[PDB]
Structure 1
Amino acid sequence: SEDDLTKVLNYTKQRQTEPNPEYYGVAKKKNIIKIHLESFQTFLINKKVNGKEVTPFLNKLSSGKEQFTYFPNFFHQTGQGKTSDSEFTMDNSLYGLPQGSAFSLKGDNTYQSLPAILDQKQGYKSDVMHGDYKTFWNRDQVYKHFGIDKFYDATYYDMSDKNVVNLGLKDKIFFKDSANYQAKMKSPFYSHLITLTNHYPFTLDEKDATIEKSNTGDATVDGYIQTARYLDEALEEYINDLKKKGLYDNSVIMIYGDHYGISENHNNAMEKLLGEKITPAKFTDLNRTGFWIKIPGKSGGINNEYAGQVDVMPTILHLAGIDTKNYLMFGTDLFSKGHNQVVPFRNGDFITKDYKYVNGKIYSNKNNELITTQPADFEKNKKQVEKDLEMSDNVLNGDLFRFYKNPDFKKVNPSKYKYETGPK
C-alpha cells in the first residue's frame, strides 16, 4: 500500500508549477473568505429576463472593475456528491468518486487538507458556516478529518418557518448572521460560507422574490431565475456588511459556483431561455460555474485561463506563501505561468483552451463544430484526464495518505475536533 501511495505521489510531480512572483506570499496570514454559490452557472452573468438583470451584483464583479478577478472559463468537476464533491475538491485538490459521495463513503479517510495546512504553517483557524444540520453529507465526520476548527451549522441560526425555504435557512438571513459571527473571530481565519436557497426545485416565496420567473414553462428553469436573483442580492448585502465590519479590504475573498443547477433534462426550456439548441457540446460549455477572487493590494480583472476547482487549493497556498512541492495535488496554481490548462470532468469528458472532448467526440471551442482531425496534443491530454481520475480514485479507495510521512504535514488527529451545538 505504501508503494501505491508512492505511485500517486510520483505521478503528481511533473505538473508542479512555480508561484508567480507577482502573487507569491502577497496574502500571507490575511483572512480568507470563501463564498459558495449553490447551483450557480455563469450563463446567468449579464443575462436579462423580462428586461431585468438576474444577477446585477455578480455582473458588476464579473466586469473586472470591482476588485475581483473573474475567470469566465472556470468549471466544477463534480459527480453524484454535488455540494460535497465541490467541497472535497476545493479543500483537497482531489476528485470525488465516479459514483456516490466521497464525503459519505470516505469520511474517515486520512487527509492532508487545505485548512489543516493553513493551520499548521500559518496559525489559521478554519470554519464552515451553513444553514443545514451538521450530519447532512456526513460533514460532521469529514470536517474533523480535514482539520476544520468550527462548524456553525443550522443550530447557530434561527430556523423558524419565517426564516426557512426548501432545504433550510434563507440565504439573506444566513449571510447577515454569518457576517456577524465572522466579525467576532480571531485573525487569521479561513472561513467558508455554504449557501442553500438556490437549490432544486428552486422555490422562493413570492414575498421574497424581486424578479418575475422566466416563461419557458419548465418550472425548474423558471424558478431558478428567482432564486438566482435572491442569492445575488444576499451576496451584495453580505459584501456591504463586510465593508461595515472592516473585513473587506484586507481579506482574500473567493466566490464560486459549486456545480451546475440545470441538467440536460431541461434542454427544451434552456433553448428557449438562451436562444440556442443545447447540444452536448453546448451543455458542456454551460458547466461553467465561475470563480471570482479579490486579493488585497491587487487590482481586479478578467482572466480567461481554462481551469477547474482542483486548481483552487494550490492557488490559495501560493497566495499565502506556502511551498507546495510535498502536497499530493492534481491542480495547479491559477496565477502561475505554467498553470496546466486542461480540465478533467468526472465522466472522462474534458476541456482545454482550444477544444472540448464530449462523449467520445472532439469539438472546437470557437463554434462547437466537430473536429475530425485529432489535435496534436489530444492523446496526451486524454491520457492525462483518464490517469488523473484513476490516480485520485486510488488515493480515496486505498486511503493512501495513511502511508505518507509528509515532511510538510503533521498527521491530523480527528478526535481533537468537535462541533458544539449552537445557541439557537
Structure 2
Amino acid sequence: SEDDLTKVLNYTKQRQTEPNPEYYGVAKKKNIIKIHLESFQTFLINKKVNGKEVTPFLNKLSSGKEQFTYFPNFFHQTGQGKTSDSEFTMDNSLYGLPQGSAFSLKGDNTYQSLPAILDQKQGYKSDVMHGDYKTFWNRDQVYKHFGIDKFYDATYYDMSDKNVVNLGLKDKIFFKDSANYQAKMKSPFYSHLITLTNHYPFTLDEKDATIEKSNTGDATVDGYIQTARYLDEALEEYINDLKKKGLYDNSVIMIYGDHYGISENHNNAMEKLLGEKITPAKFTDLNRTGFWIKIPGKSGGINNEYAGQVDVMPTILHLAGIDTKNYLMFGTDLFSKGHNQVVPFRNGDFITKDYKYVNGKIYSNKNNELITTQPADFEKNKKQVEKDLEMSDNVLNGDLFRFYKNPDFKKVNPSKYKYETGPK
C-alpha cells in the first residue's frame, strides 16, 4: 500500500515543469478569488440571440483586452459528480471517479489539497461561499479534509421566496452578499464562489430575464440563454463591487465554467442554435468551459494552449511562488513552456492541439474530419490518458495519501474544521 503510493508518485514525476520566470511567485501572498460559472460553455462567448449578446461582460473579458488572460481551449474533465467533480480536480489536480461522486464516496479520504498547501506555506485562510446548504454533495465533510477554513452556505443568505429560483439563491443576491462577506476577511485569503442560477432546467422568472429565449422549441436550450445572460450580469456587477471594495486590482481572479450544461440529448436544438450538425467530434469541441485569469501586474491576453481543470492547481501554486516537486498532481502549470498539452476526459476520450480522440476514432481539430493515418504521438498520448485516469483512481480507491510522509505537507486534522450555521 505504501508501494501503491510510491508507484503513483514515481508516475507523476516525468511531466513536472519548471515555472515560467515571468510568472513565478508574482502573486505571492496576494488574495485569490475563484469564481465558478455553473454549467457555463464557451459556445456562448460572442454568441447573439435575436441580435442581443447573451454574455456581454464575459465577451469583453474574452477579448484579452480587459486584464484577464482567456483560454478558449480549456476543458472540464468531470463525470457524474458534476460541480463536485470540478471542485475536486480544481483543488487537487486529481480526477473524479469513473462512476459516482468522489465527494460523496471518498469524503473521509486523506488529501493534500490546494487550500491546505496555501495555508501551510503562506498563511492563506480559505473559504467557499454557496447559496445551497452545506451537506449537499457532502461538502461539509469533504472541505474539512481539504482544509477549507470557512463555508458560507445557504444559512448565510436570505432564502426567502423572492430570493430563490430553481435550486436556491439567485446569483445577483449571492454575489452582492458574498462581496460584502469578502470585504470583511483578513488577507491573504483564498475565496471560492460557487453559483447556482445557470443550472438545469434553466428556469428564470420573467421579471429577472433581460434577454428573450431562443426559439429552438427545446425548453432546456431556450431557457439556458436567459440564465446564462443573468449569470453574466450578476458577474459584471460582482466585479464592479470588487473594484468599489478595493478587492480587484491586487487579487488573482480566476473564472471558469464547471462542466457542460447542454448534453447530447439536445443535439437537434443545438444544431438549430449553432447552425451546424452536432457530431461526436463537435460535441467534444463544445465541452470547452473556459478559464479566465487576472494576475496583478500582468497584462491580459488570449492564450490558445489546450488545457484542463487538472492544470489549475499547479498554475496557482507557481503564481504563489511555491515549489511543487513533492505534490502528487496530474496537471502542469499553464504558463510554463513545458505545459503538457494533452487533456484526458473522464470517459477515455482526449484532445490535444492537433487532434481529438472520441469514441475510438481520431479527428483533426482543423475541421473535425476523420484521420486514418495515426499521428506520430498517438499511442504515447493514448497511453498517458489511460494511465492518468487509472493512477488517479488508485489514489482515491486506495486512499493513498495516508501513506505519504511529504516533506512539503503537514497532515490535515479534519476535526479542526467546523462550519457554523449562519445568522440567516
What's the secondary structure of 2:324's corresponding residue?
coil
Structure 1 residue 248, shift from structure 2 partner:
0.1
What do the CA deviations read for 1:366-421 (whole angstroms, capped 9, x no partner)? 00000000000000000000000000000000000000000000000000000000
Instruction: State the alpha-carbon separation in 2 of the partners of residues 344 and 405 from structure 1.
Output: 28
Matches within 5 A, 1:198-213: 198-213=198-213
Structure 1 residue 290, shift from structure 2 partner:
0.0
What do the CA deviations read for 1:317-337 (whole angstroms, capped 9, x no partner)? 000000000000000000000
Matches within 5 A, 1:154-303: 154-303=154-303
Instruction: State the alpha-carbon separation in 2 of the partners of residues 269 and 113 from structure 1.
Output: 40
Structure 1 residue 32, shift from structure 2 partner:
0.0
Structure 2 counterpart of 1:369: 369
Instruction: State the alpha-carbon separation in 2 of the partners of residues 269 and 22 from structure 1.
Output: 45
Structure 1 residue 197, shift from structure 2 partner:
0.1
Instruction: State the alpha-carbon separation in 2 of the partners of residues 219 and 191 from structure 1.
Output: 34
Structure 1 residue 194, shift from structure 2 partner:
0.1
Structure 1 residue 103, shift from structure 2 partner:
0.0
Structure 1 residue 50, shift from structure 2 partner:
0.3
Instruction: State the alpha-carbon separation in 2 of the partners of residues 80 and 124 from structure 1.
Output: 31
What's the secondary structure of 1:15's corresponding residue?
coil
What's the secondary structure of 1:310's corresponding residue?
helix
Instruction: State the alpha-carbon separation in 2 of the partners of residues 267 and 216 from structure 1.
Output: 11
What do the CA deviations read for 1:147-171 (whole angstroms, capped 9, x no partner)? 0000000000000000000000000
Instruction: State the alpha-carbon separation in 2 of the partners of residues 423 and 233 from structure 1.
Output: 27
Structure 1 residue 57, shift from structure 2 partner:
0.0
What do the CA deviations read for 1:125-159 (whole angstroms, capped 9, x no partner)? 00000000000000000000000000000000000
Structure 1 residue 18, shift from structure 2 partner:
0.2
Instruction: State the alpha-carbon separation in 2 of the partners of residues 162 and 405 from structure 1.
Output: 51
What do the CA deviations read for 1:92-137 (whole angstroms, capped 9, x no partner)? 0000000000000000000000000000000000000000000000
Structure 1 residue 205, shift from structure 2 partner:
0.1
Structure 1 counterpart of 2:408: 408
What do the CA deviations read for 1:23-80 (whole angstroms, capped 9, x no partner)? 0000000000000000000000000000000000000000000000000000000000
The answer to whether the aligner puts 1:343 opposite 2:343 as a matched pair is: yes
TM-score by length of 1: 1.00
What do the CA deviations read for 1:334-386 (whole angstroms, capped 9, x no partner)? 00000000000000000000000000000000000000000000000000000
Instruction: State the alpha-carbon separation in 1 of the partners of residues 67 and 173 from structure 2.
Output: 25
Instruction: State the alpha-carbon separation in 2 of the partners of residues 146 and 168 from structure 1.
Output: 25
What's the secondary structure of 1:69's corresponding residue?
strand
Instruction: State the alpha-carbon separation in 2 of the partners of residues 117 and 192 from structure 1.
Output: 16
Structure 1 residue 221, shift from structure 2 partner:
0.1
What's the secondary structure of 2:208's corresponding residue?
coil
What's the secondary structure of 2:191's corresponding residue?
strand
Instruction: State the alpha-carbon separation in 1 of the partners of residues 36 and 107 from structure 2.
Output: 21
Structure 1 residue 82, shift from structure 2 partner:
0.1
Instruction: State the alpha-carbon separation in 2 of the partners of residues 328 and 139 from structure 1.
Output: 22
Instruction: State the alpha-carbon separation in 2 of the partners of residues 199 and 384 from structure 1.
Output: 33
What's the secondary structure of 1:119's corresponding residue?
helix
Structure 1 residue 199, shift from structure 2 partner:
0.1
Structure 1 residue 207, shift from structure 2 partner:
0.2
Structure 1 residue 253, shift from structure 2 partner:
0.1
**Matched residues, number:** 424
The answer to whether the aligner puts 1:381 opposite 2:414 as a matched pair is: no
Instruction: State the alpha-carbon separation in 2 of the partners of residues 165 and 323 from structure 1.
Output: 44
What's the secondary structure of 2:212's corresponding residue?
coil
What do the CA deviations read for 1:191-231 (whole angstroms, capped 9, x no partner)? 00000000000000000000000000000000000000000
What do the CA deviations read for 1:214-272 (whole angstroms, capped 9, x no partner)? 00000000000000000000000000000000000000000000000000000000000
Instruction: State the alpha-carbon separation in 2 of the partners of residues 90 and 161 from structure 1.
Output: 32
Structure 1 residue 294, shift from structure 2 partner:
0.0
What's the secondary structure of 1:143's corresponding residue?
helix
Instruction: State the alpha-carbon separation in 1 of the partners of residues 217 and 38 from structure 2.
Output: 23
Instruction: State the alpha-carbon separation in 1 of the partners of residues 250 and 216 from structure 2.
Output: 43
- How much is the aligned-residue C-alpha RMSD, in angstroms? 0.1
Runs of 4+ in 1 over 4 A off after TM superposition: none
Instruction: State the alpha-carbon separation in 1 of the partners of residues 414 and 168 from structure 2.
Output: 28
What's the secondary structure of 1:207's corresponding residue?
helix
What's the secondary structure of 1:394's corresponding residue?
helix
Matches within 5 A, 1:87-166: 87-166=87-166
Instruction: State the alpha-carbon separation in 2 of the partners of residues 286 and 45 from structure 1.
Output: 12
Structure 1 residue 298, shift from structure 2 partner:
0.2
Instruction: State the alpha-carbon separation in 2 of the partners of residues 160 and 19 from structure 1.
Output: 48
Instruction: State the alpha-carbon separation in 1 of the partners of residues 77 and 50 from structure 2.
Output: 32
Instruction: State the alpha-carbon separation in 2 of the partners of residues 370 and 249 from structure 1.
Output: 46
Instruction: State the alpha-carbon separation in 1 of the partners of residues 218 and 381 from structure 2.
Output: 37
Instruction: State the alpha-carbon separation in 1 of the partners of residues 398 and 203 from structure 2.
Output: 41
